[PDB]
Design an enzyme around this catalytic site. Structure first.
Site, PDB file in Angstrom:
ATOM      1  N   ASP A  95       0.816  -1.223   0.000  1.00 31.27           N
ATOM      2  CA  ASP A  95       0.000   0.000   0.000  1.00 31.27           C
ATOM      3  C   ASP A  95       0.851   1.276   0.000  1.00 31.27           C
ATOM      4  O   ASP A  95       1.995   1.247   0.474  1.00 31.27           O
ATOM      5  CB  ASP A  95      -0.956   0.003   1.192  1.00 31.27           C
ATOM      6  CG  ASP A  95      -2.005  -1.078   1.171  1.00 31.27           C
ATOM      7  OD1 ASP A  95      -1.751  -2.145   0.556  1.00 31.27           O
ATOM      8  OD2 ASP A  95      -3.048  -0.899   1.842  1.00 31.27           O
ATOM      9  N   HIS A 151     -13.369 -12.833   0.112  1.00 32.76           N
ATOM     10  CA  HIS A 151     -13.083 -14.256   0.047  1.00 32.76           C
ATOM     11  C   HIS A 151     -14.449 -14.934   0.344  1.00 32.76           C
ATOM     12  O   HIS A 151     -15.305 -14.289   0.958  1.00 32.76           O
ATOM     13  CB  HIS A 151     -12.005 -14.560   1.114  1.00 32.76           C
ATOM     14  CG  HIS A 151     -11.082 -13.390   1.346  1.00 32.76           C
ATOM     15  ND1 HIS A 151     -11.419 -12.363   2.220  1.00 32.76           N
ATOM     16  CD2 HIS A 151      -9.914 -13.077   0.743  1.00 32.76           C
ATOM     17  CE1 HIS A 151     -10.437 -11.480   2.137  1.00 32.76           C
ATOM     18  NE2 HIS A 151      -9.508 -11.865   1.262  1.00 32.76           N
TER      19      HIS A 151
END
Ligand code: ATP
Ligand code: MG
Ligand code: MG
Ligand code: ZN
Ligand code: ZN
Ligand code: ZN
Lengths: 159, 98, 49, 196, 65, 133, 266, 85, 43, 783, 114
Positions: free
Chosen positions: J149, J749
């Site tokens: 990030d 997920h």
RNA sequence: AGAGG
DNA sequence: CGATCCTCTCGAT
């Protein structure tokens, strides 16, 4: 469908009831049907509730529906936020869409409605109708490079 | 039982990048797809003539190792001949929390 | 270890990306739904190789 | 990254001594966190490691091929044959203190990749510099020494905070700002000025 | 790309065991594991060091200039 | 003060239950027909067997930072086997005059029930627990 | 002899196995750290490349040269150049080695640690001779050359601790275990059905008395008696790794004792 | 004009997040520009920390003009305004 | 490199999904994330 | 759009982000080079003149140093080249563009900035190395991972710009979110995991450790607490030393399941003064929980005080765990042999049940309900039996897992992982789905050419019998892959959608702000709402509280609220009141006790008519429970002594307290009525809570303590009100937007399922926001 | 690039002393010795030795950030015992402990043959 | 285009 | 007539 309803003893209890889920809408004609509770009858067509029951009911079903996307997903957003949006959409008499059609054609600024969509067409209609920009809105002051009347610049400091 | 054919090997349903993954059959569907995009951004010997080419950007691993864990497909993709990583000794641990 | 399959154009290596299209001369029937005057349509994309 | 879609930047480097160690005196080159396995479901990563451990000791390659008949059990069998606890675990000691860790660590070889894009090729900072030709705003890209885009998303973020002045400053004092001459009658930028 | 001197993990000098390792396999007809061990390479960090090494130098040398 | 309670209890049940070092012990007094007990014991330093005769004492004596004991000539109010320090957290009044106590010895829990435990515990965030034999 | 007791089980040219009785964890561990880091050694810390027509990069070669282990015997009579008075280096603070190799043979020419040459006047100090443990007499293989290639360079080996660069490690691995019976319950062994059958018991189990199954846990017991094996790379002999280990640790404690005395004046 | 009188003022007698922030802002701007300090700085050196002390002592000579949607305004002394927050 | 040389592009009813028919022809894993997801295929 | 609404800016930074266990929550680790590039114009005042003269001397390449001295008359004296850089005798009024040094305010951010918390003021701490360093507990509001990030940094240039940052956008200020009225940041990862491990009843720490742990807490009184164990070893509980990170005056209570006042399972929570009494600390206590230790510390002790707490908790827990350690191996996937046989047979019976329904359908006997095909009803049955199978086999795994199972350990703390993970990894992956339905016939009358035509069996239609441990067969593999792709595709769909929805919502509400009359109005000054949220309360200052007059039997309601002084049995006895006996059959005080009871019954009805289902818990300002519990502890409430209040005290006390809970101020008709309504709901709560019987029998309050409860309620309430100038429009738009965009992008997920939403979903919300004339599922539910 | 020089780990800087002894603000007879250019090799060792002194009430050390070679040692002693002394005594004790060890290992080494 | 989160 | 954000690279006319 199960129902939370009070016992004669006073406490709330599960009392399952028969409900009918329909595929297709004709609210107007369905509620006039006998043996049904027309006080309870519902539709996910909040546009039709707006048409049959009036703006205030429409607002309710709209929240019911906004809330339902958010919660029938997992998340929780404080009432007031969804309530604000629903109010904005409503407070006009009818259903004002969160699109270039609805809110963007509204009685707002000029330089603030060209911040969203149809930028040049909004600017031309302004130059045609000789629109007067209030310069109150956030977007207006952003273009002007001035301190907007937002939180910190909402009031005025003096000596 | 009414067979007309047989597969040469199922390992073959995969392509070059996925053919590099160890035990893909024990991995969550996407994780496999990710490593596919990833292994294409990994360093090491891209060709032997690296020392002889005038090209914008060239990254070569000092001492690239072949993987201790290999797929049979790798043989054809010349992986153990031109590797992408190193066999690091790795602990899975909560240590300094860094 | 090089495999070729690419071109060298003005000194740079060029991969010619395999382009996907639907095969022609294929006879495919489609159901055209609700706001349509025609219920079904039989199509053919005739080509000359 | 490991060979299973496990991206991670180095958080810190520790020198041999501070690192935890096995009673063999083995020490890791890398430490990944247990909290990146259950949700990721990279089960193969674990099998890969275990197998590579066996492989290094046995001095044979690992059959990480997919539709194999190779099992965690069959591997674990061999690892114990090789005198280690079968499920990858190992007793380790804290490098600072020397004391045994209450937890035993799943430790062993795992092929890891050195990927492109490194901090130093990414770090940027700007505070006045290459200003754009037409727009008169900071340029694009770290290479050009450009200014970072303060998008609408970010303007909105600041409106929400009620940070009126910062917003005006972030859009005038920094980046843009200009001084034009307006007519008190027509109200347009067609005012000629002899500023001396 | 030539046998690294010293094992990354532990530091045991490995840059001298290479040719020695190749004789054990080629001439002495030994197996990898036993050959590794025969060179005093006990720990797995020292094991991998030589086992997973790919000596591309041989290939680079091959280039004519 | 000095002391605040004293009795000999005989263990009924002994439960580890998903713990290793700790056991929740259930007992009753040899004297009082009503007097109950419930206690979390470090069965690793002081193991407790099923049906054991043990003298339970609750004092308040022997604020201010803890100094390492260093035996020297400093003698604490014990010639006991197991000692703990807790805090009063509730005093559940049941039938008649049946008073139950509530102590946490750093999360290890006590529950002594009876009748005559009046001006003996007085909500004091203090109190030590002592076990004999 | 009074305190901590040493019992050497095994000893070689570059490996010592012993027991450390009557000592605190902190001391045993601190010794292991100082043995890893804080011991000074000699290592190439400057390569000056005249010619390099090998397949390898200049820095790639320089890197390996640094790792090459070289005699650190009389290393206490060589100065840290940082505290030497010379502009740059000299004979009192550095060792100057040379490397010139030319692939002249039709076959591949190998460059070994054996091929480095001291050019500095050592002033009779046992220092910087590339340590060669290899049977055939060649050192570490530094580089390889085709018939054409040449590599001409100069090396300045300098005094330094591992704590600055891993090359300065007289190090290699140090085995370290205490209580092979977990009598201390200093770790909670993970298991599926049985801790005993699943975990393989130590070589050091022979040297201790196995628990007592139905016996109380020794709550008062303090970790003492440490089973250790120190491996030398070759720069300093094994005995000296631990002797200098003890010594340098002893030294930094003394500097901290001497530190107090300086603040004591004003 | 418009100007609501001192009598009848339905706005919060409590200073708002924003008022506090703009007050502390402006005061720090003046202190930073070598303007006089009306409080005995207890060895203080930061213009905002000094403005903070000035605020607590209520020795800030500023007035918040609270605008209402009709155009009217209610003026309040920084000192008269209750500073809970 | 090898992977680049075996790439496919499908410009523009459910073109992104891994079709049954892709069995043994296209790699089920190899596909970029987003934009070109399921349009850029690898043989 | 790009040159006016958005712009590229100077004084900007940005680079890879990394985690810091040794940083303060509100801090940001700024790399030295960055610190050396970013400047701040500091006017030369006598307060600073010496620090500034020194900085000018240090120059542009030494850290606490500057570049450029701007005097009067423009003039930028450039410190890097200037032949005078060496001297420079600064004059007042001149500015010095000094390097960004420690403790400066900076605005730190992570894109997408779809949330007020994606932008937060941070304290600088200049550091070595090239990453931006941040406290792990600020990970969530930014939505950061340390996998690569980037995160941007912006530098305020004016004193008033700095004040805005530090007084409005500060990280501690932003702790309690106004989106979900719950706090946005909590204890995560290692710290969460370890806190549980440390809070075990079994967890016992020695002096050596204790002392290190104690010194590790930066506040620390410098007083060793007495060990829980003073038997053959002074031993401390985990709970004990962690209670050192917990400040005094902190009262917290839970009750999870089997939680008694003795919690034999060590569940629930009890913290009195500032020490844990029982209950293992985990997610429910120290997470982003609405009734967590954080919401409590932030409200009770302060935001700065609470932000400091994050640090302390991490400093101890992290150290303890650095020494405890924690791993995860393949071992934690291998569940029992006898357990596998159960899982195996669980699948077997589901599979046979399926074959049966199929054979029944194939015999033209399976008869669908109404509204759906025999084929339609067939599938959902088979689909059901197969999910039921995976779930049952999954629980079989979960239950068989030991307390030492590192994965179970993580879900137990709630640090990472879920049931499904256990299930999939170790027992059964499950059935694959694409467009809702299970794997379809891509090939003619088959899902693959390894199958025969017309095979509706679980395996043929994509049911994965195997676990990730066991491995998947090529068919299972490809099917998993097919479903897996679905996820990736819908991210690349829904994110481009949800994100548009965001800007639209944001543009549509930009200018909606609370005015200086609690009125919610736009740019035109049109009334949108007459009070924000219909109550003129700030969202951040609200939390779910139970209304006790709404629920329960009329019987239980009587037992609780009713007091008949004219009835010997049903009156309050003199054990719990000084005036008790002196009051039996009062008639005049029975008139007040009666008036109280009727308002209590008036509400009971009113509430049952507003909250029709009988939902008790609603988010309301001022947590009364905490105020009560506080007074009890603060005044060391002697539950054995009677009290000093009169019926006249409690009745007119609660009665007058309500007259003073101000939202609006006007003395007129509409305004006094608007105000009266604004408070209705809260007053029910207040009355329900502070009724006579309840005050005396339940709380057992004293006059001194009660008087304070009233003052605390009044003050807390006033603080709880919305501030005019609150940009409620942008706020609401983002508060609806942010979740949407993150119900995707996540996205995934896993592969089973996780739809509805994507599916329900963003297309529906799209229909709603667009006011779609032609909806996809027009339903009518008739009662 | 933004990394420090590896000698910053053992080399004292501009001015900068090894020990900075500062009186504890909280509890009495306590002090905070900041050891500059030092780790767990010295911290833990001094700390554990101090804990053997049956006149030292409190003794703990922390390494506030890993980037820096610097540690904080807190010492609290009984009335009439300067903690500076408690440390001095501890330091001395270690040197002696190590002395014996050198002598012992040396002795044993000579008896060993290889 | 290609790529990153 | 609209279709998420920001970033970074190479290098066609
Ligand atoms: N196309 C995109 N547009 C906007 N934001 C994106 C996009 N792709 C990714 N992101 C942002 O960055 C994150 C990228 O996913 P990321 O790899 O960091 O995390 P993840 O879902 O936890 O998976 P992983 O297991 O690999 O860590 C997102 O969760 C989101 O905030
Ligand atoms: Mg991540
Ligand atoms: Mg990420
Ligand atoms: Zn004009
Ligand atoms: Zn090694
Ligand atoms: Zn010299």
């Amino acid at each position: 469908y199960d129902r939370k309803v009070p016992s004669p003893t006073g406490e709330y209890v599960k009392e399952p009831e028969w409900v009918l889920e329909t595929d297709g809408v004709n609210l107007s004609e369905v509620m006039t049907v006998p043996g049904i509770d027309p006080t309870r009858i519902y539709t996910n067509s909040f546009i039709d509730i707006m048409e049959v029951l009036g703006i205030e009911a429409g607002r309710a079903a709209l929240y019911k529906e906004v809330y339902n996307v958010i919660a029938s997903d997992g998340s929780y957003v404080n009432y007031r936020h969804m309530a604000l949006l629903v109010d904005v959409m409503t407070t006009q008499g009818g259903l004002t869409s969160v699109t270039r059609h609805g809110f963007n054609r509204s009685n707002t600024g000029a330089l603030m409605r060209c911040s969203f969509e149809e930028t040049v067409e909004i600017l031309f209609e302004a130059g045609a109708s000789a629109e007067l920009d209030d310069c109150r809105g956030v977007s207006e002051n952003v273009i002007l490079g001035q301190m907007a009347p937002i939180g910190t610049g909402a009031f005025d400091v003096m000596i | 039982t009414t067979f007309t054919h047989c597969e040469i090997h199922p390992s073959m349903i995969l392509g070059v990048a996925a053919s590099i993954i160890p035990f893909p059959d024990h991995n969550q569907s996407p994780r496999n797809t990710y490593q596919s995009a990833m292994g294409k951004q990994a360093m090491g010997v891209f060709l032997t003539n690296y020392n002889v080419r005038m090209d914008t950007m060239a990254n070569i691993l000092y001492y690239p190792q072949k993987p201790l864990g290999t797929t049979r497909a790798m043989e054809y993709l010349k992986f153990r001949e031109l590797p992408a990583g190193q066999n690091a000794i790795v602990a899975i641990a909560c240590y300094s929390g860094y | 270890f090089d495999m070729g399959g690419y071109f060298i154009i003005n000194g740079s290596e060029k991969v010619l990306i395999a382009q996907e299209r639907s095969a022609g001369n294929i006879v495919q029937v489609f159901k055209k739904a609700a706001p349509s005057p025609i219920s079904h349509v039989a199509e053919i994309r005739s080509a000359l190789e | 990254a490991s060979r299973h879609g496990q991206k991670g930047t180095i958080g810190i480097t520790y020198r041999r001594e501070d690192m935890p160690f096995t009673a063999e005196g083995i020490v890791p080159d890398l430490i990944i966190n247990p909290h990146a396995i259950p949700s990721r479901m990279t089960v193969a990563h674990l099998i890969e490691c275990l197998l590579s451990k066996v492989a290094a000791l046995s001095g044979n390659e690992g059959d990480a091929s997919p539709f194999t008949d190779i099992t965690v059990e069959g591997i674990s069998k061999l690892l114990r044959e090789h005198g280690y606890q079968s499920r990858g675990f190992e007793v380790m000691y804290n490098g600072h203190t020397g004391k045994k860790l209450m937890a035993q660590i799943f430790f062993g070889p795992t092929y890891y990749q050195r990927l492109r894009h490194m901090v130093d090729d990414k770090i940027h900072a700007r505070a006045r510099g290459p200003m754009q030709v037409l727009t008169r705003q900071p340029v694009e890209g770290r290479s050009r020494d450009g200014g970072l885009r303060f998008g609408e998303m970010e303007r909105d973020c600041m409106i929400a905070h009620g940070a009126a002045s910062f917003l005006k400053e972030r859009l005038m004092e920094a980046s843009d700002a200009f001084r034009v001459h307006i007519c008190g009658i027509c109200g347009l930028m067609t005012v000629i000025a002899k500023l001396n | 790309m030539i046998v690294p001197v010293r094992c990354f993990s532990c530091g045991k000098v490995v840059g001298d065991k290479w040719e020695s390792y190749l004789n054990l396999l080629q001439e002495d007809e030994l197996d990898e594991g036993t050959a590794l061990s025969r060179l005093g390479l006990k720990r797995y960090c020292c094991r991998r060091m030589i086992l997973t090494h790919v000596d591309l130098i041989e290939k680079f040398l091959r280039y004519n200039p | 003060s000095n002391t605040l309670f004293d009795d000999i209890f005989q263990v009924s049940e002994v439960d580890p239950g998903r713990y290793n070092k700790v056991c929740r012990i259930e007992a009753a007094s040899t004297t009082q027909d009503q007097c109950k007990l419930t206690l979390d014991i470090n069965v690793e330093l002081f193991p407790v067997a099923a049906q054991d005769s043990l003298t339970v004492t609750i004092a308040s004596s022997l604020t201010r930072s803890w100094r390492p004991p260093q035996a020297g000539d400093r003698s604490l109010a014990d010639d006991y086997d197991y000692v703990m320090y807790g805090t009063a957290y509730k005093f559940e009044e049941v039938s008649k005059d049946l008073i139950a106590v509530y102590y946490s010895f750093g999360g290890l829990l006590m529950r002594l029930e009876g009748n005559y435990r009046n001006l003996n515990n007085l909500k004091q965030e203090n109190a030590y627990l002592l076990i004999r034999r | 002899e009074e305190g901590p007791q040493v019992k050497i089980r095994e000893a070689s040219k570059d490996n010592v196995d012993f027991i450390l009785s009557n000592v605190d964890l902190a001391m045993a561990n601190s010794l292991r750290r100082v043995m890893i880091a804080e011991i000074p050694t000699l290592a190439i810390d400057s390569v000056e490349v005249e010619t390099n027509t090998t397949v390898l990069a200049d820095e790639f070669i320089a890197h390996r040269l640094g790792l090459i282990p070289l005699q650190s015997m009389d290393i206490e009579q060589l100065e840290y150049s940082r505290d030497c008075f010379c502009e740059d280096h000299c004979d009192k603070c550095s060792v100057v080695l040379t490397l010139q190799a030319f692939g002249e043979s039709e076959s591949t020419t190998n460059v070994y640690s054996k091929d480095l040459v001291i050019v500095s006047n050592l002033m009779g100090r046992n220092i910087g001779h590339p340590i060669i443990q290899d049977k055939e007499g060649n050192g570490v293989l530094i580089c390889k050359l085709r018939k054409g290639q040449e590599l001409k360079l100069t090396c300045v080996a300098k005094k330094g601790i591992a704590k600055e660069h891993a090359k300065w490690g007289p190090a290699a691995a140090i085995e370290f275990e205490y209580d092979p019976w977990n009598k201390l319950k200093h770790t909670d062994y993970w298991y599926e059905q049985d801790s005993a059958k699943e975990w393989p018991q130590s070589k050091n189990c022979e040297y201790e008395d196995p628990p007592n199954e139905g016996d109380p846990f020794d709550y008062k017991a303090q970790a003492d008696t440490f089973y250790m094996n120190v491996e030398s790379v070759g720069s300093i002999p094994v005995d000296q790794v631990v002797v200098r280990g003890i010594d340098t640790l002893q030294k930094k404690v003394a500097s901290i004792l001497l530190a107090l005395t300086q603040m004591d004046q004003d | 004009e418009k100007a609501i009188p001192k009598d009848q003022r339905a706005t919060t007698p409590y200073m708002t997040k924003y008022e506090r922030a703009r007050i502390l802002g402006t005061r720090a701007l003046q202190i930073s520009m070598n303007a006089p300090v009306f409080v005995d700085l207890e060895g203080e050196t930061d213009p905002l920390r000094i403005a903070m002390k000035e605020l607590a002592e209520k020795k800030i000579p500023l007035v918040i003009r609270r605008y209402l949607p009709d155009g009217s305004f209610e003026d309040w002394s920084v000192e008269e305004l209750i500073v809970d927050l | 490199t090898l992977s680049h040389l075996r790439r496919t592009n499908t410009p523009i009813a459910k073109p992104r999904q891994l079709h049954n028919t892709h069995w043994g022809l296209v790699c089920p894993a190899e596909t970029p994330e987003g934009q070109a997801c399921g349009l850029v295929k690898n043989l | 759009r790009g040159n006016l609404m958005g712009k590229r800016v100077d004084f900007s930074a940005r680079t890879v982000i990394s985690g810091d266990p040794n940083l303060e929550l509100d801090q940001v680790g700024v790399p030295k080079s960055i610190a050396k590039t970013l400047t701040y114009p500091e006017v030369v005042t006598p307060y600073n003149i010496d620090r500034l003269t020194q900085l000018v001397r240090n120059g542009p390449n030494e850290h606490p140093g500057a570049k450029y001295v701007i005097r009067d008359s423009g003039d930028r004296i450039d410190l890097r080249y200037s032949k005078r850089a060496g001297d420079i005798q600064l004059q007042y009024g001149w500015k010095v563009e000094r390097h960004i040094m420690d403790n400066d305010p900076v605005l730190f951010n992570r894109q997408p900035s779809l949330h007020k918390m994606s932008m937060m003021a941070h304290r600088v701490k200049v550091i070595p190395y090239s990453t931006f360093r941040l406290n792990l507990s600020v990970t969530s509001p930014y939505n950061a991972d340390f996998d690569g990030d980037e995160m941007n940094l912006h530098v305020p240039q004016s004193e008033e710009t700095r004040a805005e940052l530090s007084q409005l956008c500060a990280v501690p200020l932003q702790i309690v979110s106004p989106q979900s009225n719950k706090p946005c940041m909590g204890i995560v990862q290692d710290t969460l995991c370890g806190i549980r491990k440390l809070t075990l009843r079994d967890t016992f720490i020695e002096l050596d450790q204790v002392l290190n742990m104690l010194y590790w807490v930066p506040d620390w009184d410098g007083v060793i607490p007495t060990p829980a164990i003073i038997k053959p070893k002074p031993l401390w509980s985990g709970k004990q030393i962690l209670s050192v990170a917990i400040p005094n005056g902190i009262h917290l209570q839970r009750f999870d399941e089997g939680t008694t006042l003795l919690s034999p399972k060590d569940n629930g929570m009890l913290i009195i003064d500032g020490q844990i009494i029982f209950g293992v600390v985990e997610k429910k206590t120290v997470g982003s929980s609405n009734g967590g230790l954080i919401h409590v510390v932030t409200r009770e002790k302060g935001p700065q005080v609470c932000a400091k707490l994050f640090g302390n908790i991490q400093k101890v827990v992290n150290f303890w765990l650095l020494h405890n350690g924690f791993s995860t191996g393949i071992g934690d996937t291998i569940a029992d042999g006898p357990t596998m046989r159960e899982i195996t047979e669980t699948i077997a019976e589901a599979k046979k049940k399926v074959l049966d329904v199929t054979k029944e359908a194939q015999a033209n006997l399976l008869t669908a309900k109404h509204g759906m095909t025999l084929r339609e009803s067939f599938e959902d049955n088979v689909v059901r039996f197969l999910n039921e199978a995976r779930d049952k086999a999954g629980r079989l795994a979960e239950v068989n897992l030991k307390d030492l199972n590192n994965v179970k350990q993580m879900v137990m703390a709630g640090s990472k992982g879920s049931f499904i993970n256990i299930a999939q990894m170790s027992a059964c992956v499950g059935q694959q789905s694409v467009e809702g339905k299970r794997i379809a016939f891509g090939f003619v009358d088959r899902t693959l050419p390894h199958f025969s035509k017309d095979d509706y069996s679980p395996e043929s239609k994509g049911f994965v019998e195997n676990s990730y441990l066991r491995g998947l067969t090529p068919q299972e593999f490809f099917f998993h892959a097919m479903g897996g792709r679905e996820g990736l595709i819908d991210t690349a769909v829904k994110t481009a959608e949800t994100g548009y929805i965001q800007r639209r919502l944001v543009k549509a509400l930009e200018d909606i702000m609370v005015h200086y009359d609690n009125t919610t109005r736009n740019s035109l000054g049109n009334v949108i709402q007459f009070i924000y949220g219909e109550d003129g309360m700030d969202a951040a200052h609200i939390e779910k509280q139970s209304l006790d007059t709404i629920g329960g039997s009329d019987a239980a309601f009587e037992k609780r609220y009713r007091v008949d002084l004219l009835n010997t049995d049903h009156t309050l006895d003199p054990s719990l009141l000084e005036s008790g006996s002196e009051i039996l059959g009062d008639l005049k005080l029975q008139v007040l006790l009666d008036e109280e009871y009727k308002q209590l019954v008036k509400d009971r009805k009113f509430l049952r008519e507003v909250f029709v289902d009988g939902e008790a818990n609603w988010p309301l300002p001022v947590n009364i429970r905490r105020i009560i519990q506080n007074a009890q502890q603060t005044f060391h409430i002697d539950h054995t002594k009677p009290s000093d209040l009169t019926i006249k005290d409690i009745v007119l006390g609660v009665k007058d307290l309500q007259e003073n809970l101000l939202v609006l101020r006007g003395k007129n008709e509409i305004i006094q009525n608007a105000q009266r309504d604004a408070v209705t709901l809260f007053c029910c709560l207040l009355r329900s809570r502070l009724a006579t019987r309840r005050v005396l029998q339940e709380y057992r309050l004293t006059k001194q303590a009660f008087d304070w409860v009233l003052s605390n309620i009044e003050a807390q309430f006033l603080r709880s009100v919305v501030h005019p100038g609150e940009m409620v429009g942008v706020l609401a738009a983002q508060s609806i937007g942010e979740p949407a965009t993150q119900m995707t992008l996540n996205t995934f997920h896993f592969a089973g399922v996780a739809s509805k939403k994507v599916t329900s979903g963003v297309p529906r919300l799209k229909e709603i926001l667009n006011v779609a004339k032609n909806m996809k599922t027009p339903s009518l539910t008739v009662y | 690039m933004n990394a420090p020089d590896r000698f910053e780990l053992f080399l004292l800087g501009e001015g900068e002393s090894k020990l900075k002894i500062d009186p504890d603000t909280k509890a009495p007879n306590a002090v905070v010795i900041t050891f500059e250019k030092e780790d767990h090799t010295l911290g833990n060792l001094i700390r554990a030795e101090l804990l053997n002194d049956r006149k030292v009430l409190f003794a703990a050390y922390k390494v506030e950030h890993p980037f820096f070679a610097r540690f904080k040692l807190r010492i609290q002693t009984t009335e009439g015992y300067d903690p500076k002394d408690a440390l001095k005594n501890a330091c001395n004790s270690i040197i002696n402990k190590l002395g014996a060890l050198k002598t012992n290992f040396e002795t044993e080494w000579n008896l060993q043959t290889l």
